[PDB]
mmCIF file of C-alpha atoms (C1' of nucleotides) and ligand atoms in Angstrom:
data_model
loop_
_atom_site.group_PDB
_atom_site.id
_atom_site.type_symbol
_atom_site.label_atom_id
_atom_site.label_comp_id
_atom_site.label_asym_id
_atom_site.label_seq_id
_atom_site.Cartn_x
_atom_site.Cartn_y
_atom_site.Cartn_z
ATOM 1 C CA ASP X 1 -38.906 59.597 21.187
ATOM 2 C CA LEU X 2 -40.541 62.125 18.893
ATOM 3 C CA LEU X 3 -40.011 59.179 16.530
ATOM 4 C CA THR X 4 -41.847 56.819 18.864
ATOM 5 C CA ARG X 5 -44.562 59.469 19.215
ATOM 6 C CA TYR X 6 -44.865 60.154 15.470
ATOM 7 C CA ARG X 7 -45.149 56.409 14.777
ATOM 8 C CA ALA X 8 -48.301 56.219 16.945
ATOM 9 C CA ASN X 9 -50.553 58.432 14.794
ATOM 10 C CA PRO X 10 -48.590 59.515 11.693
ATOM 11 C CA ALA X 11 -51.230 61.544 9.904
ATOM 12 C CA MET X 12 -51.678 63.216 13.333
ATOM 13 C CA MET X 13 -48.397 65.078 12.947
ATOM 14 C CA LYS X 14 -49.236 66.192 9.407
ATOM 15 C CA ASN X 15 -47.554 69.550 10.107
ATOM 16 C CA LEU X 16 -44.200 67.968 10.994
ATOM 17 C CA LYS X 17 -41.216 69.551 9.285
ATOM 18 C CA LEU X 18 -37.660 68.505 8.589
ATOM 19 C CA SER X 19 -36.113 70.942 11.064
ATOM 20 C CA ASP X 20 -38.270 69.492 13.874
ATOM 21 C CA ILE X 21 -36.044 66.390 13.619
ATOM 22 C CA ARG X 22 -32.730 68.118 14.081
ATOM 23 C CA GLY X 23 -31.449 65.933 16.921
ATOM 24 C CA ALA X 24 -33.086 62.655 15.988
ATOM 25 C CA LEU X 25 -31.918 62.241 12.371
ATOM 26 C CA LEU X 26 -30.124 58.976 13.089
ATOM 27 C CA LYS X 27 -33.126 57.307 14.735
ATOM 28 C CA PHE X 28 -35.506 58.653 12.097
ATOM 29 C CA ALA X 29 -33.301 57.664 9.136
ATOM 30 C CA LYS X 30 -32.847 54.072 10.408
ATOM 31 C CA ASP X 31 -36.581 53.606 11.009
ATOM 32 C CA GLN X 32 -38.989 52.272 8.398
ATOM 33 C CA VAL X 33 -41.569 54.980 9.126
ATOM 34 C CA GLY X 34 -38.964 57.618 9.994
ATOM 35 C CA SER X 35 -37.018 57.291 6.748
ATOM 36 C CA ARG X 36 -40.244 57.502 4.738
ATOM 37 C CA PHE X 37 -41.057 60.738 6.547
ATOM 38 C CA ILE X 38 -37.665 62.239 5.670
ATOM 39 C CA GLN X 39 -37.955 61.179 2.037
ATOM 40 C CA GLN X 40 -41.518 62.438 1.556
ATOM 41 C CA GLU X 41 -40.465 65.765 3.109
ATOM 42 C CA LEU X 42 -37.406 66.099 0.853
ATOM 43 C CA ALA X 43 -39.551 65.396 -2.216
ATOM 44 C CA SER X 44 -42.381 67.794 -1.327
ATOM 45 C CA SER X 45 -40.339 70.623 0.208
ATOM 46 C CA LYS X 46 -39.348 73.604 -1.942
ATOM 47 C CA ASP X 47 -37.279 74.987 0.969
ATOM 48 C CA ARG X 48 -33.480 74.693 0.650
ATOM 49 C CA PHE X 49 -32.960 75.605 4.320
ATOM 50 C CA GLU X 50 -35.351 72.970 5.710
ATOM 51 C CA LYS X 51 -33.504 70.359 3.652
ATOM 52 C CA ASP X 52 -30.101 71.608 4.790
ATOM 53 C CA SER X 53 -31.308 71.713 8.409
ATOM 54 C CA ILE X 54 -30.713 67.948 8.781
ATOM 55 C CA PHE X 55 -28.002 67.744 6.090
ATOM 56 C CA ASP X 56 -25.276 68.452 8.644
ATOM 57 C CA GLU X 57 -26.616 65.506 10.621
ATOM 58 C CA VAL X 58 -26.770 63.300 7.525
ATOM 59 C CA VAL X 59 -23.094 64.127 6.888
ATOM 60 C CA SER X 60 -22.094 63.457 10.505
ATOM 61 C CA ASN X 61 -23.833 60.065 10.609
ATOM 62 C CA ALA X 62 -23.237 59.057 6.982
ATOM 63 C CA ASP X 63 -21.006 56.084 7.719
ATOM 64 C CA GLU X 64 -23.706 54.522 9.895
ATOM 65 C CA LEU X 65 -26.433 55.307 7.334
ATOM 66 C CA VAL X 66 -25.006 54.262 3.956
ATOM 67 C CA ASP X 67 -25.397 50.489 4.569
ATOM 68 C CA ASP X 68 -28.644 50.730 6.548
ATOM 69 C CA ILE X 69 -31.686 49.046 5.023
ATOM 70 C CA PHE X 70 -33.660 52.310 5.300
ATOM 71 C CA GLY X 71 -30.947 54.930 5.795
ATOM 72 C CA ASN X 72 -29.351 54.318 2.417
ATOM 73 C CA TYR X 73 -32.472 55.754 0.766
ATOM 74 C CA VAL X 74 -32.218 58.861 2.965
ATOM 75 C CA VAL X 75 -28.557 59.519 2.123
ATOM 76 C CA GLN X 76 -29.329 59.008 -1.580
ATOM 77 C CA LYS X 77 -32.097 61.635 -1.556
ATOM 78 C CA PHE X 78 -29.534 64.273 -0.578
ATOM 79 C CA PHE X 79 -27.833 63.883 -3.931
ATOM 80 C CA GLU X 80 -31.104 64.854 -5.639
ATOM 81 C CA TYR X 81 -30.967 68.595 -4.741
ATOM 82 C CA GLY X 82 -27.341 69.763 -4.590
ATOM 83 C CA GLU X 83 -24.742 71.416 -6.667
ATOM 84 C CA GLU X 84 -21.026 70.709 -6.324
ATOM 85 C CA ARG X 85 -20.692 72.289 -2.872
ATOM 86 C CA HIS X 86 -23.579 70.212 -1.555
ATOM 87 C CA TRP X 87 -22.310 67.075 -3.342
ATOM 88 C CA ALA X 88 -18.731 67.564 -2.113
ATOM 89 C CA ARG X 89 -19.690 67.520 1.555
ATOM 90 C CA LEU X 90 -21.584 64.252 1.038
ATOM 91 C CA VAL X 91 -18.698 62.645 -0.879
ATOM 92 C CA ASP X 92 -16.216 63.752 1.797
ATOM 93 C CA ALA X 93 -18.311 62.180 4.536
ATOM 94 C CA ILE X 94 -18.007 58.780 2.832
ATOM 95 C CA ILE X 95 -14.882 58.950 0.662
ATOM 96 C CA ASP X 96 -12.585 57.135 3.074
ATOM 97 C CA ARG X 97 -14.686 53.963 3.309
ATOM 98 C CA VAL X 98 -15.710 53.826 -0.368
ATOM 99 C CA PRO X 99 -13.453 50.730 -0.743
ATOM 100 C CA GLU X 100 -15.762 48.919 1.716
ATOM 101 C CA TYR X 101 -19.034 50.575 0.690
ATOM 102 C CA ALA X 102 -18.651 49.169 -2.845
ATOM 103 C CA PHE X 103 -19.014 45.568 -1.572
ATOM 104 C CA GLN X 104 -22.104 46.213 0.555
ATOM 105 C CA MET X 105 -25.675 45.568 -0.461
ATOM 106 C CA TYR X 106 -27.121 48.942 0.575
ATOM 107 C CA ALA X 107 -24.053 51.203 0.529
ATOM 108 C CA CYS X 108 -23.301 50.313 -3.109
ATOM 109 C CA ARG X 109 -26.538 52.090 -4.135
ATOM 110 C CA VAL X 110 -25.289 55.288 -2.477
ATOM 111 C CA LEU X 111 -22.094 54.993 -4.538
ATOM 112 C CA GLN X 112 -24.100 54.420 -7.723
ATOM 113 C CA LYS X 113 -26.424 57.330 -7.002
ATOM 114 C CA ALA X 114 -23.397 59.543 -6.358
ATOM 115 C CA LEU X 115 -21.841 58.655 -9.713
ATOM 116 C CA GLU X 116 -25.257 59.198 -11.323
ATOM 117 C CA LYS X 117 -25.572 62.748 -10.019
ATOM 118 C CA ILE X 118 -22.269 64.433 -9.162
ATOM 119 C CA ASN X 119 -19.910 66.367 -11.414
ATOM 120 C CA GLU X 120 -16.906 64.716 -13.030
ATOM 121 C CA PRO X 121 -14.234 65.918 -10.532
ATOM 122 C CA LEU X 122 -16.242 64.330 -7.719
ATOM 123 C CA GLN X 123 -16.733 61.140 -9.764
ATOM 124 C CA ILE X 124 -12.982 60.882 -10.241
ATOM 125 C CA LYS X 125 -12.515 61.307 -6.497
ATOM 126 C CA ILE X 126 -14.793 58.311 -5.904
ATOM 127 C CA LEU X 127 -12.982 56.283 -8.590
ATOM 128 C CA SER X 128 -9.632 57.021 -6.903
ATOM 129 C CA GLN X 129 -10.838 54.975 -3.923
ATOM 130 C CA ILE X 130 -12.220 52.231 -6.182
ATOM 131 C CA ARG X 131 -8.701 51.926 -7.694
ATOM 132 C CA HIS X 132 -7.607 50.073 -4.556
ATOM 133 C CA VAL X 133 -10.135 47.250 -4.781
ATOM 134 C CA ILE X 134 -11.129 47.223 -8.422
ATOM 135 C CA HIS X 135 -10.324 43.574 -9.260
ATOM 136 C CA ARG X 136 -12.368 42.100 -6.407
ATOM 137 C CA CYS X 137 -14.947 44.823 -6.996
ATOM 138 C CA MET X 138 -15.604 43.805 -10.646
ATOM 139 C CA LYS X 139 -16.812 40.315 -9.773
ATOM 140 C CA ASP X 140 -18.545 41.200 -6.476
ATOM 141 C CA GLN X 141 -22.303 40.598 -6.337
ATOM 142 C CA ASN X 142 -22.582 44.222 -5.184
ATOM 143 C CA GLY X 143 -19.354 45.738 -6.516
ATOM 144 C CA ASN X 144 -19.999 45.013 -10.203
ATOM 145 C CA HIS X 145 -22.935 47.473 -10.302
ATOM 146 C CA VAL X 146 -20.626 50.255 -9.067
ATOM 147 C CA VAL X 147 -18.102 49.427 -11.788
ATOM 148 C CA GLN X 148 -20.867 49.195 -14.394
ATOM 149 C CA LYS X 149 -22.100 52.582 -13.166
ATOM 150 C CA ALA X 150 -18.622 54.041 -13.555
ATOM 151 C CA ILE X 151 -18.341 52.887 -17.172
ATOM 152 C CA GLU X 152 -21.785 54.257 -18.044
ATOM 153 C CA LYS X 153 -21.478 57.700 -16.404
ATOM 154 C CA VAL X 154 -17.774 58.714 -16.500
ATOM 155 C CA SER X 155 -15.904 59.693 -19.671
ATOM 156 C CA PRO X 156 -13.742 56.834 -21.038
ATOM 157 C CA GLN X 157 -10.352 58.382 -20.234
ATOM 158 C CA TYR X 158 -11.064 58.284 -16.490
ATOM 159 C CA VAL X 159 -12.023 54.593 -16.406
ATOM 160 C CA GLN X 160 -8.775 53.502 -18.100
ATOM 161 C CA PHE X 161 -7.778 51.894 -14.793
ATOM 162 C CA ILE X 162 -10.844 49.636 -15.118
ATOM 163 C CA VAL X 163 -9.826 48.564 -18.625
ATOM 164 C CA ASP X 164 -6.220 48.047 -17.439
ATOM 165 C CA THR X 165 -7.631 45.813 -14.705
ATOM 166 C CA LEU X 166 -9.426 43.674 -17.286
ATOM 167 C CA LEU X 167 -5.992 43.358 -18.903
ATOM 168 C CA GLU X 168 -4.026 42.962 -15.707
ATOM 169 C CA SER X 169 -3.170 39.314 -16.437
ATOM 170 C CA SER X 170 -3.511 36.940 -19.361
ATOM 171 C CA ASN X 171 -6.533 35.155 -17.938
ATOM 172 C CA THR X 172 -8.471 38.101 -16.538
ATOM 173 C CA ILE X 173 -10.916 38.779 -19.373
ATOM 174 C CA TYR X 174 -11.625 35.036 -19.511
ATOM 175 C CA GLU X 175 -12.059 34.941 -15.717
ATOM 176 C CA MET X 176 -14.317 37.999 -15.925
ATOM 177 C CA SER X 177 -16.177 36.746 -19.008
ATOM 178 C CA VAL X 178 -17.221 33.527 -17.246
ATOM 179 C CA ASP X 179 -18.110 35.243 -13.985
ATOM 180 C CA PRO X 180 -21.830 35.981 -13.395
ATOM 181 C CA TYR X 181 -20.989 39.533 -12.297
ATOM 182 C CA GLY X 182 -17.689 40.073 -14.047
ATOM 183 C CA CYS X 183 -19.325 39.421 -17.423
ATOM 184 C CA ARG X 184 -21.565 42.463 -17.020
ATOM 185 C CA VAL X 185 -18.492 44.671 -16.534
ATOM 186 C CA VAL X 186 -16.934 43.323 -19.758
ATOM 187 C CA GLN X 187 -20.178 44.035 -21.605
ATOM 188 C CA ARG X 188 -20.448 47.601 -20.321
ATOM 189 C CA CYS X 189 -16.851 48.094 -21.377
ATOM 190 C CA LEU X 190 -17.560 46.937 -24.963
ATOM 191 C CA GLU X 191 -20.553 49.299 -25.031
ATOM 192 C CA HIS X 192 -18.981 52.514 -23.735
ATOM 193 C CA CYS X 193 -15.190 52.466 -23.866
ATOM 194 C CA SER X 194 -13.149 53.941 -26.716
ATOM 195 C CA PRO X 195 -11.798 51.615 -29.464
ATOM 196 C CA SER X 196 -8.310 52.182 -28.033
ATOM 197 C CA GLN X 197 -9.651 50.532 -24.906
ATOM 198 C CA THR X 198 -11.883 47.860 -26.395
ATOM 199 C CA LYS X 199 -9.266 46.670 -28.919
ATOM 200 C CA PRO X 200 -6.959 44.763 -26.494
ATOM 201 C CA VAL X 201 -9.993 43.644 -24.454
ATOM 202 C CA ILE X 202 -11.522 42.140 -27.577
ATOM 203 C CA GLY X 203 -8.128 40.775 -28.570
ATOM 204 C CA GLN X 204 -8.074 38.740 -25.364
ATOM 205 C CA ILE X 205 -11.629 37.428 -25.918
ATOM 206 C CA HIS X 206 -10.490 36.087 -29.336
ATOM 207 C CA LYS X 207 -7.652 34.100 -27.723
ATOM 208 C CA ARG X 208 -10.053 31.907 -25.717
ATOM 209 C CA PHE X 209 -13.017 32.421 -27.995
ATOM 210 C CA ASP X 210 -14.426 28.885 -28.106
ATOM 211 C CA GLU X 211 -14.471 28.595 -24.318
ATOM 212 C CA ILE X 212 -16.088 31.989 -23.715
ATOM 213 C CA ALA X 213 -18.575 31.367 -26.557
ATOM 214 C CA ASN X 214 -19.987 28.236 -24.912
ATOM 215 C CA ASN X 215 -19.873 29.551 -21.361
ATOM 216 C CA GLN X 216 -23.235 30.321 -19.762
ATOM 217 C CA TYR X 217 -22.118 33.939 -19.155
ATOM 218 C CA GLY X 218 -19.322 34.291 -21.706
ATOM 219 C CA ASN X 219 -21.731 33.783 -24.611
ATOM 220 C CA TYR X 220 -23.184 37.210 -23.816
ATOM 221 C CA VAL X 221 -19.666 38.701 -23.907
ATOM 222 C CA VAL X 222 -19.140 37.219 -27.369
ATOM 223 C CA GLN X 223 -22.537 38.469 -28.523
ATOM 224 C CA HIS X 224 -21.597 41.981 -27.414
ATOM 225 C CA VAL X 225 -18.386 41.751 -29.452
ATOM 226 C CA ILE X 226 -20.442 40.851 -32.513
ATOM 227 C CA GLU X 227 -22.584 43.918 -31.966
ATOM 228 C CA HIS X 228 -20.044 46.426 -30.603
ATOM 229 C CA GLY X 229 -16.698 45.255 -32.063
ATOM 230 C CA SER X 230 -15.027 46.233 -35.312
ATOM 231 C CA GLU X 231 -15.878 45.045 -38.806
ATOM 232 C CA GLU X 232 -12.737 42.935 -38.526
ATOM 233 C CA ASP X 233 -13.960 41.361 -35.285
ATOM 234 C CA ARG X 234 -17.228 40.347 -36.928
ATOM 235 C CA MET X 235 -15.192 38.843 -39.779
ATOM 236 C CA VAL X 236 -12.880 36.855 -37.485
ATOM 237 C CA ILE X 237 -15.878 35.557 -35.567
ATOM 238 C CA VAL X 238 -18.161 34.638 -38.478
ATOM 239 C CA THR X 239 -15.146 32.967 -40.102
ATOM 240 C CA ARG X 240 -14.397 30.896 -37.028
ATOM 241 C CA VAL X 241 -18.084 30.043 -36.534
ATOM 242 C CA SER X 242 -18.393 29.003 -40.172
ATOM 243 C CA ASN X 243 -15.307 26.764 -40.022
ATOM 244 C CA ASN X 244 -16.691 25.021 -36.934
ATOM 245 C CA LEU X 245 -20.394 25.414 -37.595
ATOM 246 C CA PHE X 246 -21.638 22.047 -36.372
ATOM 247 C CA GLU X 247 -19.665 22.224 -33.134
ATOM 248 C CA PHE X 248 -20.864 25.767 -32.317
ATOM 249 C CA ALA X 249 -24.467 24.972 -33.274
ATOM 250 C CA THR X 250 -24.811 21.749 -31.263
ATOM 251 C CA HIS X 251 -23.801 23.191 -27.859
ATOM 252 C CA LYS X 252 -26.157 24.938 -25.479
ATOM 253 C CA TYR X 253 -24.533 28.335 -25.114
ATOM 254 C CA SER X 254 -22.475 28.795 -28.295
ATOM 255 C CA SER X 255 -25.575 28.154 -30.415
ATOM 256 C CA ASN X 256 -26.775 31.628 -29.370
ATOM 257 C CA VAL X 257 -23.561 33.091 -30.816
ATOM 258 C CA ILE X 258 -24.400 31.874 -34.328
ATOM 259 C CA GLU X 259 -27.894 33.314 -33.967
ATOM 260 C CA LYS X 260 -26.295 36.657 -33.092
ATOM 261 C CA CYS X 261 -24.036 36.393 -36.147
ATOM 262 C CA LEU X 262 -27.162 35.747 -38.228
ATOM 263 C CA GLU X 263 -29.008 38.647 -36.596
ATOM 264 C CA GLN X 264 -26.193 41.227 -36.879
ATOM 265 C CA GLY X 265 -24.212 39.958 -39.871
ATOM 266 C CA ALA X 266 -24.159 41.449 -43.338
ATOM 267 C CA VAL X 267 -25.137 39.495 -46.448
ATOM 268 C CA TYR X 268 -21.608 38.139 -46.949
ATOM 269 C CA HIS X 269 -21.489 37.023 -43.304
ATOM 270 C CA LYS X 270 -24.753 35.119 -43.768
ATOM 271 C CA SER X 271 -23.334 33.756 -47.010
ATOM 272 C CA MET X 272 -20.376 32.163 -45.200
ATOM 273 C CA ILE X 273 -22.641 30.516 -42.624
ATOM 274 C CA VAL X 274 -25.183 29.186 -45.126
ATOM 275 C CA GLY X 275 -22.235 28.005 -47.194
ATOM 276 C CA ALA X 276 -20.780 26.027 -44.320
ATOM 277 C CA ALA X 277 -24.259 24.721 -43.528
ATOM 278 C CA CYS X 278 -24.796 23.334 -47.062
ATOM 279 C CA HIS X 279 -21.409 21.706 -47.677
ATOM 280 C CA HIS X 280 -21.924 17.973 -48.292
ATOM 281 C CA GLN X 281 -18.861 15.901 -47.409
ATOM 282 C CA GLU X 282 -18.734 13.088 -49.997
ATOM 283 C CA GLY X 283 -19.547 10.519 -47.312
ATOM 284 C CA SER X 284 -22.108 12.330 -45.145
ATOM 285 C CA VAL X 285 -25.460 14.096 -44.823
ATOM 286 C CA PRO X 286 -25.064 17.902 -45.127
ATOM 287 C CA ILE X 287 -24.333 19.851 -41.952
ATOM 288 C CA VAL X 288 -27.691 21.654 -42.088
ATOM 289 C CA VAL X 289 -29.698 18.424 -42.007
ATOM 290 C CA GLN X 290 -27.652 17.094 -39.081
ATOM 291 C CA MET X 291 -28.201 20.457 -37.389
ATOM 292 C CA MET X 292 -31.943 19.997 -37.793
ATOM 293 C CA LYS X 293 -31.778 16.767 -35.714
ATOM 294 C CA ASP X 294 -29.973 18.432 -32.792
ATOM 295 C CA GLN X 295 -31.481 19.839 -29.602
ATOM 296 C CA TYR X 296 -29.799 23.227 -30.101
ATOM 297 C CA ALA X 297 -28.752 23.350 -33.745
ATOM 298 C CA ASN X 298 -32.350 23.080 -34.930
ATOM 299 C CA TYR X 299 -32.967 26.554 -33.525
ATOM 300 C CA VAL X 300 -29.913 27.767 -35.431
ATOM 301 C CA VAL X 301 -31.348 26.454 -38.708
ATOM 302 C CA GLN X 302 -34.648 28.192 -37.915
ATOM 303 C CA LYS X 303 -32.834 31.484 -37.266
ATOM 304 C CA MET X 304 -31.028 30.989 -40.601
ATOM 305 C CA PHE X 305 -34.246 30.639 -42.634
ATOM 306 C CA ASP X 306 -35.585 33.737 -40.876
ATOM 307 C CA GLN X 307 -32.557 35.997 -41.516
ATOM 308 C CA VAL X 308 -30.890 35.034 -44.793
ATOM 309 C CA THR X 309 -31.768 36.328 -48.258
ATOM 310 C CA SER X 310 -34.247 34.473 -50.474
ATOM 311 C CA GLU X 311 -31.384 33.252 -52.663
ATOM 312 C CA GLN X 312 -29.536 31.997 -49.584
ATOM 313 C CA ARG X 313 -32.794 30.372 -48.460
ATOM 314 C CA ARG X 314 -33.158 28.674 -51.848
ATOM 315 C CA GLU X 315 -29.742 27.109 -51.264
ATOM 316 C CA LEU X 316 -30.961 25.861 -47.883
ATOM 317 C CA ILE X 317 -34.247 24.512 -49.238
ATOM 318 C CA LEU X 318 -32.525 22.668 -52.087
ATOM 319 C CA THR X 319 -30.124 21.016 -49.604
ATOM 320 C CA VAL X 320 -32.695 20.144 -46.957
ATOM 321 C CA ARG X 321 -35.570 18.957 -49.128
ATOM 322 C CA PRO X 322 -34.081 15.592 -50.229
ATOM 323 C CA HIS X 323 -34.149 14.644 -46.489
ATOM 324 C CA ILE X 324 -37.374 15.868 -44.776
ATOM 325 C CA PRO X 325 -39.697 12.918 -43.867
ATOM 326 C CA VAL X 326 -36.452 11.435 -42.556
ATOM 327 C CA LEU X 327 -36.493 14.484 -40.230
ATOM 328 C CA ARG X 328 -40.095 14.102 -39.026
ATOM 329 C CA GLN X 329 -39.022 10.713 -37.626
ATOM 330 C CA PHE X 330 -36.843 12.598 -35.139
ATOM 331 C CA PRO X 331 -37.999 14.014 -31.767
ATOM 332 C CA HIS X 332 -39.877 17.330 -32.158
ATOM 333 C CA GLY X 333 -39.250 17.098 -35.924
ATOM 334 C CA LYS X 334 -42.999 17.561 -36.408
ATOM 335 C CA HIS X 335 -42.825 20.984 -34.747
ATOM 336 C CA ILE X 336 -39.385 21.771 -36.228
ATOM 337 C CA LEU X 337 -40.283 21.195 -39.877
ATOM 338 C CA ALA X 338 -43.660 22.817 -39.336
ATOM 339 C CA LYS X 339 -42.074 26.108 -38.294
ATOM 340 C CA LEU X 340 -40.257 25.928 -41.662
ATOM 341 C CA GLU X 341 -43.348 25.084 -43.755
ATOM 342 C CA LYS X 342 -43.566 28.845 -44.458
ATOM 343 C CA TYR X 343 -40.529 28.376 -46.734
ATOM 344 C CA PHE X 344 -41.477 25.000 -48.277
ATOM 345 C CA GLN X 345 -44.939 25.849 -49.690
ATOM 346 C "C1'" U R 1 -37.299 21.137 -28.010
ATOM 347 C "C1'" G R 2 -32.433 25.554 -25.768
ATOM 348 C "C1'" U R 3 -29.274 30.949 -21.759
ATOM 349 C "C1'" A R 4 -28.201 35.729 -17.117
ATOM 350 C "C1'" C R 5 -28.353 40.634 -15.039
ATOM 351 C "C1'" A R 6 -29.375 43.099 -7.209
ATOM 352 C "C1'" U R 7 -32.383 47.124 -2.033
ATOM 353 C "C1'" A R 8 -38.007 48.765 2.162
HETATM 354 CL CL1 CL S 1 -24.584 41.686 0.687
#
RNA sequence: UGUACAUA
């Protein structure tokens, strides 16, 4: 009603305050114009008691606001000015339905904002609800962002249950690594968890490495292992890539994994890949020249020339050059061997 | 000539 009146001429109630809303918070918070009023007031006010004047009403109506298209923004703003006592009341208002809020488009942003802002005891209280639904939650279109947020903002020892969920069955890190949302959880885990946690997670990735490497989402998991795994992980991967260079290079997704090995590898890593690329089986064209005729592997050769040492390049040039005008015959060869003219002049 | 990552 005051809402319906304020909507008429908004800049005509320019002296409206937060405590003039104190019975209409629900209607205001669920209204496009009303929620923008509340937010603009919370951001401009330097008055703790005006802000707290509707806070009791935000708490009382929280469960109806957290998954509202406009109310979720209102609830979130009340994490921006508290300390623990103010954060604890908010968390209590929602804690019991956190298992559902994590799956919801709007309410999941309240859960993320809470983890962003509240102290660690309160974070752990939110995670204790997530424990119940964590497997579903990891690969939910909404739930994965809450799990990602947990891994980024909570110390590693209190997300152990998330890591143990990735390891809950033999096929779980595979299942997660090929899921469009699950794969982001795996990547956050490789970025932020302790080596005690990432070791068995990476161990499982190695077991089904080829499959994950050529999956449209798993290839990012493998790339994150190359960057965030141990020196011994990079060695097991470069070694396997080198031994199967042509097969990795000629497939859509796994070709990016070689490029990552080239980009992040040390000199001896690059040496093993160039070595495999230049081996000439007594009855065949060298692997590198075949790679240059392939829709994906030609980009891998280009990445090679760009990242390897001059002496490793010399080995490539001396193996390619007895076969070039034979390569211009091929489709896009003109543009392929032109991008490499820099190294043939 | 070849790949992702969410709210008015
Ligand atoms: Cl949804």
